[PDB]
Design a protein around this ligand. Structure first.
Ligand code: K
Ligand code: K
Ligand code: K
Ligand code: K
Ligand code: K
Ligand code: K
Ligand code: K
Ligand code: K
Ligand code: K
Ligand code: K
Ligand code: K
Ligand code: K
Ligand code: K
Ligand code: K
Ligand code: K
Ligand code: K
Ligand code: K
Ligand code: K
Ligand code: K
Ligand code: K
Ligand code: K
Ligand code: K
Ligand code: K
Ligand code: K
Ligand code: K
Ligand code: K
Ligand code: K
Ligand code: K
Ligand code: K
Ligand code: K
Ligand code: K
Ligand code: K
Ligand code: K
Ligand code: K
Ligand code: K
Ligand code: K
Ligand code: MG
Ligand code: MG
Ligand code: MG
Ligand code: MG
Ligand code: MG
Ligand code: MG
Ligand code: MG
Ligand code: MG
Ligand code: MG
Ligand code: MG
Ligand code: MG
Ligand code: MG
Ligand code: MG
Ligand code: MG
Ligand code: MG
Ligand code: MG
Ligand code: MG
Ligand code: MG
Ligand code: MG
Ligand code: MG
Ligand code: MG
Ligand code: MG
Ligand code: MG
Ligand code: MG
Ligand code: MG
Ligand code: MG
Ligand code: MG
Ligand code: MG
Ligand code: MG
Ligand code: MG
Ligand code: MG
Ligand code: MG
Ligand code: MG
Ligand code: MG
Ligand code: MG
Ligand code: MG
Ligand code: MG
Ligand code: MG
Ligand code: MG
Ligand code: MG
Ligand code: MG
Ligand code: MG
Ligand code: MG
Ligand code: MG
Ligand code: MG
Ligand code: MG
Ligand code: MG
Ligand code: MG
Ligand code: MG
Ligand code: MG
Ligand code: MG
Ligand code: MG
Ligand code: MG
Ligand code: MG
Ligand code: MG
Ligand code: MG
Ligand code: MG
Ligand code: MG
Ligand code: MG
Ligand code: MG
Ligand code: MG
Ligand code: MG
Ligand code: MG
Ligand code: MG
Ligand code: MG
Ligand code: MG
Ligand code: MG
Ligand code: MG
Ligand code: MG
Ligand code: MG
Ligand code: MG
Ligand code: MG
Ligand code: MG
Ligand code: MG
Ligand code: MG
Ligand code: MG
Ligand code: MG
Ligand code: MG
Ligand code: MG
Ligand code: MG
Lengths: 271, 46
RNA sequence: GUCUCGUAGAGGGGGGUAGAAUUCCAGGUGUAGCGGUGAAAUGCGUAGAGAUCUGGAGGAAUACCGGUGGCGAAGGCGGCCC
RNA sequence: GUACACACCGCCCGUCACACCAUGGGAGUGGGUUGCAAAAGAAGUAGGUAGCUUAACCUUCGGGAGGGCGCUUACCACUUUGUGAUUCAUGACUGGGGUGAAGUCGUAACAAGGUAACCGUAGGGGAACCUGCGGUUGGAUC
RNA sequence: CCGAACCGACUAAUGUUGAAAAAUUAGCGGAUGACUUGUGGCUGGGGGUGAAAGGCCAAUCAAACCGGGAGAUAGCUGGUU
RNA sequence: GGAAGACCAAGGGUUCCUGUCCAACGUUAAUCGGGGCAGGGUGAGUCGACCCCUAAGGCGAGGCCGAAAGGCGUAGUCGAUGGGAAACAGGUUAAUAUUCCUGUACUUGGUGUUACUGCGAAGGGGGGACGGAGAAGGCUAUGUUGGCCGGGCGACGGUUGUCCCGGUUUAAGCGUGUAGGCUGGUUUUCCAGGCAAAUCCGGAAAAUCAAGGCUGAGGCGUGAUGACGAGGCACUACGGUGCUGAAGCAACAAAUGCCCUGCUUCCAGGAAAAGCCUCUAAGCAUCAGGUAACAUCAAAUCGUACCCCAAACCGACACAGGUGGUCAGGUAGAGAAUACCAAGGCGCUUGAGAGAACUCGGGUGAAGGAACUAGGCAAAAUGGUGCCGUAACUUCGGGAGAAGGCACGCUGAUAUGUAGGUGAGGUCCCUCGCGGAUGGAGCUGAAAUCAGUCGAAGAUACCAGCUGGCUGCAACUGUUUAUUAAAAACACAGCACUGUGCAAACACGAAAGUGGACGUAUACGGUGUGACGCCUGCCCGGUGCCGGAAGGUUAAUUGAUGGGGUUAG
RNA sequence: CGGGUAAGUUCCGACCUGCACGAAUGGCGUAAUGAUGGCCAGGCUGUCUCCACCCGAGACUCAGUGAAAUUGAACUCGCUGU
């Protein structure tokens, strides 16, 4: 549910929380945990290569099954859990043979539900099939781009993909961006939408709430000196130039896609 | 007031010690130079 | 006022679906106009429009039935199916 | 059909300009009344009583009882302080309203008033108003 | 929220061949957080890092320090027994 | 005296102790010294390092990449600031001590017996193993008072008592298993999981029992017929030694330490690997190996002095500076503030006079009270707790400690000490205990009311908000010019535009790669704006960006055609 | 122009003649917040009228130790002129 905080202090007045009473309150499933230490946005030259990253809360990595290739064996949802690594929630599922795995939690999935993968799985939310076996027009998520590679599209909270057509070895998908994209029909997809759609309704409310998430402050280029940024300089607030990135490329409409290798799969760009 | 030299023997040896000098060709040229000058103490190594 | 049996109904809420049409996209044929008005012009068109054929996308509304017909406290309620 | 009757060469709307009148807002300000919280404590009455002083009663003649004065405490009028409420007056400037008079700008309404009018709402416009959406007939023609 | 430790540095006086190449004294702000601190690690000079002051990068910064090209060049100033 | 005491890490390196000397060093003198010279001094199976294990990160066989130098990285190997066995009390030196001595312990390993016996890993599973905040209860450290024991009878009125002073200490280990915390137990059968196997973990289905296990402070017992112990006595080379030794209990208060890696709750969702336990594979088979008891041996090496908020470290100085961790007594107090003290440590390495101007740091001030000045700068002032009471405005939280006001010491009574807390004996019960119930002796003890009483003054010192009215800017908490600027600047939650379909855009990089991200459009980058409320109008001619592609123009490339040189003729 | 003052180039409220505001290099408001800028009042005072006295540390004298910047050379006065 979406809950406004009461304004008992200035840093709380605008906070809006997403509170889900169904998420597990205890610890995660340890055999599927890994450590995952932070980067500060720095690569192996030790240089900052993505600005505005650092700090925030310590986080363990949950191994999530994006391939969904344990075919023919049913699993039951044991519990939903918070995952710090992503916007979606995850579900711990127990297979009939006694194996446990984490999956992205689809909308509507709850403890006790049954799921299955494979060519013969039923058309139900949480089931995974090759898109060859999914009716045209369906809504799916966690879509593979190459067969067997694992889900890569529509994984964020509340997202989904529409299967709009099927021609030969390929299906045409409408992505969340609005792009129409061809993908091999042997690629798998999970029925339904990714859950936690209220994610986008939260309001951080204060500066520190962004710092808790590992985001460091953004300094506007127009607030700098010319040596630092093309926008810098001026006696007072001055601008007088076409907006650019810190490295000089126009940043208000100039397109940057240049991938002739994958152009053949884009039926229609998002705009 | 806190001054610039805050000693630590581990940091001294890791930064400037004999084995650190021997690890790169530029550090071995430091040692070659100091031997040619005839320094009594080649490095910080105690 | 309660119960029994039946009757008509665009009464309400939820879900699904169908056909016509408009627009847009692609392609075929085709060539100098189209559109609009009281008359015009802006606009669109040789970078091939308008017209005509095929395929696709999408939203909204449900021709005929239809009725000084019906239902609902009023506001209001109209394809079909559950 | 009509809001016309010196009868459409009729009637009539609003801004703007001019004059006068009452009124709302207004940095505030100045009076009246009053709430609350305290401070204050004349006189009086009541309680207490170191100290002082006593006609009637009792004395074993020394005094005792009782009284008075003084002092003190309680209650309380004047008065004082702080902060509210309410009411009256007033205020540069400003909002609309009424009346008069008719100058300037148009012609919104009354006939189908020349785009039927009106209602709620929203946006726009020197002004009457115009436009969208739903609604009404208190619409002429057919 | 009030307030010590701890982290700061708004005002004044002193000090200015200082006790100190940035402090002392009286006051001052934060004080469960975008907090503070120990140890170790990583980023290197047209480069780093920067809640951005051209700030900081060993009392050095509109391009660090050390060595070299090097006796750069100096239509300028001084000096020339 | 929450240090100017005690003790570590770091850093230093003989500064430590003793004798001796006073040139130089010491801001003066110096017989003294962290100074000179000489001698002495650091004792470990248990403390630390080394060691086993890993984090960030480093290096890195082959490898991939790069003119060379080199860059990245796999298997690996390093790397603590983190995980991993074990010792305490007393005594002793001029100088070391958990290291020496006395007493009493514990750990790991090698051997060898004995008894019994499926052992076996580079593999599987478990465990190790983890956040913030908050709330209590049970405790101990520790303190206070009483009792006890020893001593005292007071330089000046009084002091045989309801008087004064001191002491009243004891560990690890071993045994016991309590307040509390967590979890149902046991036995069969079966199985697509745990790269193979598995009796282990996971899963499924039954039967049966309902209490079984795990964890755990403290207390109690033992350790201890010991040790220590006020003092006494005897010697001193008057520094100190030698000898002996009483009581050694209770109640109450009580941590920020322990139970607690708990419990409750929240979102920002909280290392790793080994030691450890367990499972089997290859293999081994009356062998090895495993388990237990007993014996015996081993536990090396290096550090250990001394300073450590400092005269020994970082600041050129015996420099008002800087420096992480641990300990935490009394009275008042909310307190680690503050005042006065304890233990303990110090008077800061020039002094002696004088009592001018002037400077510095402070105290008080007649009448006036901001007239000062750029400006109330500075100063003065306010200041506590409880209660009464508190406006506009407001985002309904605030504003607010608004403002303003009253009470406050001591003594007695209520009540020989109250409400409350704590809780003994006794008594009862028991599934007999570190038990329940009852009962309340003793101990501790607010706050209030009434009466009285002293002073000019009772929040008496130290300590400890000045308040209100109008307005600009920025929403707010934050950040910044180390060393003249703290702000209206930067950031910020929120908003918008725009890029980006994943081998993402983008960034570091001749490259390999790496970050973005083990993320996937509810995501990530760039840019502007800057909570929130009401809003955000017109202009696409210029510059940019986006789309278009018929025509004009146009590169390398191609080399038609024309012209020339040469000369067989 | 109004308010506040005995007196107000600042302040507050208005007017509009905006040299040269204006809508996310945002416009206009805004409770709360600020070692932020301006203005007013009560309290308070040595800030001041206008300073006085006092307590300490220097200054001064004696003993000990013992610097510095600077410096062509000096037997280093005023005035009026040059
Ligand atoms: K999450
Ligand atoms: K910013
Ligand atoms: K700029
Ligand atoms: K600027
Ligand atoms: K500037
Ligand atoms: K270093
Ligand atoms: K019905
Ligand atoms: K008026
Ligand atoms: K008024
Ligand atoms: K009309
Ligand atoms: K009409
Ligand atoms: K209308
Ligand atoms: K106009
Ligand atoms: K930290
Ligand atoms: K820079
Ligand atoms: K340097
Ligand atoms: K440089
Ligand atoms: K000295
Ligand atoms: K002397
Ligand atoms: K005496
Ligand atoms: K030692
Ligand atoms: K004190
Ligand atoms: K003198
Ligand atoms: K009691
Ligand atoms: K206070
Ligand atoms: K604003
Ligand atoms: K500040
Ligand atoms: K700034
Ligand atoms: K608001
Ligand atoms: K708000
Ligand atoms: K334009
Ligand atoms: K343009
Ligand atoms: K802009
Ligand atoms: K705004
Ligand atoms: K400020
Ligand atoms: K202000
Ligand atoms: Mg960013
Ligand atoms: Mg993340
Ligand atoms: Mg931003
Ligand atoms: Mg700037
Ligand atoms: Mg530039
Ligand atoms: Mg400007
Ligand atoms: Mg300009
Ligand atoms: Mg009025
Ligand atoms: Mg009286
Ligand atoms: Mg009209
Ligand atoms: Mg009309
Ligand atoms: Mg109305
Ligand atoms: Mg219009
Ligand atoms: Mg129209
Ligand atoms: Mg700072
Ligand atoms: Mg200070
Ligand atoms: Mg504050
Ligand atoms: Mg505070
Ligand atoms: Mg260089
Ligand atoms: Mg500048
Ligand atoms: Mg510097
Ligand atoms: Mg340069
Ligand atoms: Mg040269
Ligand atoms: Mg030269
Ligand atoms: Mg020496
Ligand atoms: Mg010594
Ligand atoms: Mg000596
Ligand atoms: Mg001397
Ligand atoms: Mg001498
Ligand atoms: Mg000596
Ligand atoms: Mg010595
Ligand atoms: Mg490497
Ligand atoms: Mg190699
Ligand atoms: Mg490694
Ligand atoms: Mg290792
Ligand atoms: Mg360590
Ligand atoms: Mg010692
Ligand atoms: Mg105790
Ligand atoms: Mg004890
Ligand atoms: Mg006597
Ligand atoms: Mg004992
Ligand atoms: Mg014991
Ligand atoms: Mg604490
Ligand atoms: Mg020692
Ligand atoms: Mg000294
Ligand atoms: Mg010092
Ligand atoms: Mg410190
Ligand atoms: Mg204390
Ligand atoms: Mg103190
Ligand atoms: Mg004198
Ligand atoms: Mg004096
Ligand atoms: Mg003075
Ligand atoms: Mg004074
Ligand atoms: Mg005075
Ligand atoms: Mg006096
Ligand atoms: Mg006076
Ligand atoms: Mg006064
Ligand atoms: Mg004045
Ligand atoms: Mg003056
Ligand atoms: Mg002041
Ligand atoms: Mg003061
Ligand atoms: Mg207070
Ligand atoms: Mg107790
Ligand atoms: Mg102003
Ligand atoms: Mg601010
Ligand atoms: Mg500065
Ligand atoms: Mg400053
Ligand atoms: Mg990548
Ligand atoms: Mg801005
Ligand atoms: Mg004026
Ligand atoms: Mg004036
Ligand atoms: Mg003004
Ligand atoms: Mg502007
Ligand atoms: Mg402008
Ligand atoms: Mg605009
Ligand atoms: Mg603009
Ligand atoms: Mg703009
Ligand atoms: Mg702004
Ligand atoms: Mg602040
Ligand atoms: Mg002298």
């Amino acid at each position: 549910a979406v809950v406004k905080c009461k304004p008992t202090s200035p840093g709380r007045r605008h906070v809006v929380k997403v509170v889900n009473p169904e998420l597990h309150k205890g610890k995660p499933f340890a055999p599927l945990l890994e450590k995952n230490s932070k980067s500060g946005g720095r690569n192996n030259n030790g240089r900052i290569t993505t600005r505005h990253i650092g700090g925030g809360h310590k986080q363990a990595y949950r191994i999530v099954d994006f391939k969904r290739n344990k075919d023919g064996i049913p699993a039951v949802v044991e519990r939903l859990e918070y995952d710090p690594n992503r916007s979606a929630n995850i579900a711990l599922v127990l297979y009939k043979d006694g194996e446990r795995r984490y999956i992205l939690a689809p909308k509507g999935l709850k403890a006790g539900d049954q799921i299955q993968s494979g060519v013969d799985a039923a058309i139900k939310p949480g089931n995974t099939l090759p898109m060859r076996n999914i009716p045209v027009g369906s809504t799916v998520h966690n879509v593979e781009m190459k067969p067997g590679k694992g889900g890569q599209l529509a994984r964020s909270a509340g997202t989904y993909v529409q299967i709009v057509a099927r021609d030969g070895a390929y299906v045409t998908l409408r992505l969340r961006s609005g792009e129409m994209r061809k993908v091999e029909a042997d690629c798998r997809a999970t029925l339904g939408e990714v859950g936690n759609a209220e994610h986008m309704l939260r309001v951080l409310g204060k500066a520190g709430a962004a710092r808790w998430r590992g985001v460091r402050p953004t300094v506007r280029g127009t607030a700098m000196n010319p040596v630092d940024h093309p926008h810098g300089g001026g006696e007072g607030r001055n601008f007088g130039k076409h907006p650019v990135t810190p490295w000089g490329v126009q940043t208000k409409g100039k397109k940057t896609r240049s991938n002739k290798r994958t152009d053949k799969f884009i039926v229609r760009r998002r705009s | 007031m806190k001054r610039t030299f805050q000693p630590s023997v581990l940091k001294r040896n890791r930064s400037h010690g004999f084995r650190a000098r021997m690890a790169t060709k530029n550090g071995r040229q430091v040692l070659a130079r100091r031997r040619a000058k005839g320094r009594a103490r080649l490095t910080v190594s105690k």
